[PDB]
Amino acid sequence: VAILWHEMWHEGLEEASRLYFGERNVKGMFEVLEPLHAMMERGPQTLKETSFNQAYGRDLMEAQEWCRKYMKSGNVKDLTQAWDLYYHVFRRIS
């Protein structure tokens, strides 16, 4: 299917934060986020995917890294640092 990266990340982040913050589902949080990070990995193919990448690309990649660190450390503090960056990009997408 065809979806704007702007829209994909908006609904994706809303879903992930509901699962983590609302339902205490960290496993489910990883389920929804990983696909969206995988899409970014193949890279922008349109002008709108390119501009989104230029604006929000560094922040999302850094957030993925804090998620990655959580995975090794067990430090809930690392997950909150990821969500600080996710919140930041979200409120600019809106």
Added chain:
Amino acid sequence: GVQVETISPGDGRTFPKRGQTCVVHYTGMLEDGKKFDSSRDRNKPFKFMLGKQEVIRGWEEGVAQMSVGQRAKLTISPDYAYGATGHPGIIPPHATLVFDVELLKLE
């Protein structure tokens, strides 16, 4: 429920409506004064839309009865906050929370 104790008075007439965006500064702490989060440490205010379940019930009901400019002390029962589960690694089970929150403006 939630108890609201005034630290500094607001204008007494400009209250938030459901669907309005409340801009606040907050410092949150466990009932023994241990701080867990503060927007003032970040120098940037916190925004949330009232009556949308974006935030815990204690905030929804506590902030609703504040008027612009007012700095209040919200004492929130675990029932109006994170309950028996709490928030793993951050907020313990059955925790009463205390927020110092100032309603800066409405949008």
